[PDB]
Amino acid sequence: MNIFEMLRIDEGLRLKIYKDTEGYYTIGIGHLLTKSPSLNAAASELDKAIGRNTNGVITKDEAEKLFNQDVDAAVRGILRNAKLKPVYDSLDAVRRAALINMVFQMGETGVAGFTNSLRMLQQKRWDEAAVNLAKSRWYNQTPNRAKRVITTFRTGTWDAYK
């Protein structure tokens, strides 16, 4: 297991524009297109992202391309963020995958806002951090996914994904 397989499990793969759990236009492996309600604004961002007139549909290769960019940007954002970098640096390899996952779903800004859980992870207080992480809109809104990430942070293993 690795970050790619983990996120592919959490986000799925759709080749047609769809709406995410928050109702925003998305495509591929959880690639958010836009927060606007306009399917047209969404189709525009899509074409812009792919470099072609897509008519709302992409191939698998294209999706995976967006995916690779997305993961890379997730990691780069973490290393560029003063609040997140130190946590990341402190973690072991599996746990790092869990922080990336959060950043990918909720953005650097959202994650950075989990101040207390971040401090706990940095201190390696696994069970405490797990409890704190769960007291969040994130967990209430996408509980199955949140549990998997949380368990990953708690155990430092990939069990939740096996």
The one among 23, 92, 93, 144 contacting Cl ion by CB under 5 A: 144
| CB-based contact 24:32 (threshold 8 Å) | yes
Give CA–CA dist 72/66, Å, rounded: 10
Give CA–CA dist 102/100, Å, rounded: 5
Give the phi and the psi of residue 34 in degrees, each rounded to 5: -165, 155
**Residue 80 half-sphere exposure toward CB, CA atoms < 13 A:** 10
51 is a site residue for Cl ion (CB under 5 A): no
- The least distance separating Cl ion from the CB of residue 105, rounded to whole angstroms, comes to 10
- The least distance separating Cl ion from the CB of residue 147, rounded to whole angstroms, comes to 8
148 is a site residue for Cl ion (CB under 5 A): no
Q: Of 2-10, 33-41, 85-93, 134-142, which segment contacts Cl ion by CB under 5 A?
A: 134-142
Is 89 part of the annotated catalytic residue set? no
Q: Which residues does 135 contact at the CB level (< 8 Å), separation at least 6?
A: none
Q: Which residues are catalytic?
A: 11, 20
Contact residues toward Cl ion (CB under 5 A) are 49, 142, 144-145
Q: Which residues are annotated as a binding site for substrate?
A: 32, 104, 117, 132
